[PDB]
Structure 1
Amino acid sequence: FLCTFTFNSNNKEYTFPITLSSTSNPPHGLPSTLRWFFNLFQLYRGPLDLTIIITGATDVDGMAWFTPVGLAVDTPWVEKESALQIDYKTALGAVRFNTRRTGNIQIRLPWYSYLYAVSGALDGLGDKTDSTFGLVSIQIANYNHSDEYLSFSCYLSVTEQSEFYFPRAPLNSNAMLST
């Protein structure tokens, strides 16, 4: 498990980062096992597999796109109307799904970084840059709120092309949170 969120209105966007930092406390951050695992070791380098699962309202088309770090992106962990062009969005590559037909998606996230790896345990300045893997965003349109709620959920897994380096000490029992 990674996160869950709900659109309350039509034509809105939501952007959450994949942030291995432990300074981030859930609901914004890594919870449960992920928060645990990415703190076992110092460095992480490689692709990831991501699956999003859709609940509630049907007949809803939506687009998702992956934004590497440093590039322009909307305020994370926040639901707000899009600030960007449909042209800038589709250039990063995008799936376009409909919640009538699929109800789930599984898609691999590339490793695009100007960094060697992305460390999970860091503080202060280095924590804001080096600890962010990338920002998955989701935009939905044609959501008529006469319908019921629309819930999303995200689940991360690790490919065989990921690599883990230099084991650290595991987290104390007061630093492992849950969602």
Structure 2
Amino acid sequence: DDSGGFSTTVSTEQNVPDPQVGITTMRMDVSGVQAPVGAITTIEDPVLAKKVPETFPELKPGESRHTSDHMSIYKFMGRSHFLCTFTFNSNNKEYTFPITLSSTSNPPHGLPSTLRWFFNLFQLYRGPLDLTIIITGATDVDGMAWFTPVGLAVDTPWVEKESALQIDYKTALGAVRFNTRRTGNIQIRLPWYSYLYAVSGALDGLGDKTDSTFGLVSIQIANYNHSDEYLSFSCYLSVTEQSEFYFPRAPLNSNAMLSTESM
């Protein structure tokens, strides 16, 4: 140990990341007609505990019928999962929602379902995210959206109100404009712009207010005479290849897994 420490017994890796593949394949038997020594061990000892488990004679499983391995985070979370949804009531108004891993913030004012679950499987996250948002209802409604990084000015969260920000400021942080008639959906990438090294969901109050946020999104409508239908917005997030995940946590207990029950 370079830290000036010494020991007589060893120190092996405990709970090592990505140990085996997630699809049945051959990376004979898997164990058999020999003697299952891995049927007994002293779990308290980290070394011994890694001894491969084996109890009876088995054969090699074989090959899975499907191409890709569904257990590769990149591919799994590659399926843009649900994030949140809101609805505009008056014209020339705006909504601003934060992207917060916080296990504390319960939906709708917080991370829901899968996304909630996923982001609490590990301690640190960093890297871009591909947000995609679906428009529901209205038509011929001009709209705009911008990504605001943690620690900067931005209209009050989880609240529909008249923007209090200079058009200049908004556009300046990089923004996008669209119209319900011509589209009905937007898929744009959110940058890893933060003064932190990474963000986390599992935290306590204080840090849970600064270090638990990727950033924020703000959507502002225009030309929406409410003589028209209603205007709904739904947001979904998908992890990118440039996204990283460090240190595995114990998954959230079921009682804390919540979902925004609707339809």
TM range (shorter): over 0.9
CA distance in 1, matches of 2:100, 2:254: 20
Correspondent of 1:114 among 179, 184, 195? 195
CA distance in 1, matches of 2:84, 2:228: 23
Equivalent residue of 1:2, what SS?
Answer: strand
Residue 78 of structure 1, CA deviation: 0.3
Equivalent residue of 2:206, what SS?
Answer: helix
CA distance in 2, matches of 1:34, 1:55: 22
User: Which is bigger in relative contact order (C-alpha 8 A, separation at least 6)?
Assistant: 1
CA distance in 2, matches of 1:22, 1:85: 33
Residues 110-131 of structure 1 show CA distances to partners (whole Å, capped at 9, x for unaligned) of 0101000001100111100000
CA distance in 1, matches of 2:156, 2:250: 32
Residue 164 of structure 1, CA deviation: 0.3
Residues 43-102 of structure 1 show CA distances to partners (whole Å, capped at 9, x for unaligned) of 001000001100111000100000001110111000000101100000001110000000
Residue 32 of structure 1, CA deviation: 0.3
CA distance in 1, matches of 2:242, 2:197: 15
Structure (1/2) with the larger strand percentage: 1
CA distance in 1, matches of 2:198, 2:208: 13
Residues 142-173 of structure 1 show CA distances to partners (whole Å, capped at 9, x for unaligned) of 01100110000000000000000000000111
CA distance in 2, matches of 1:20, 1:171: 12
Residue 107 (structure 2) pairs with residue 22 (structure 1): no
- Residue 94 (structure 2) aligns with: 13
Equivalent residue of 1:80, what SS?
Answer: coil
- Within a 5 Å distance, the mapping from 1:139-178 to structure 2 comes to 139-178=220-259
Correspondent of 2:186 among 102, 105, 119? 105
CA distance in 2, matches of 1:55, 1:124: 35
CA distance in 1, matches of 2:252, 2:208: 17
**Greater Rg by CA:** 2
- Residue 116 (structure 2) aligns with: 35
Residue 21 of structure 1, CA deviation: 0.6
Residues 24-43 of structure 1 show CA distances to partners (whole Å, capped at 9, x for unaligned) of 00001110000000000000
CA distance in 1, matches of 2:253, 2:150: 29
TM-score (norm 2): 0.68
Equivalent residue of 2:255, what SS?
Answer: coil
CA distance in 2, matches of 1:81, 1:45: 32
- Aligned-pair identity (%): 100
RMSD of aligned Cα (Å): 0.5
CA distance in 2, matches of 1:175, 1:162: 25
- Residue 94 (structure 1) aligns with: 175
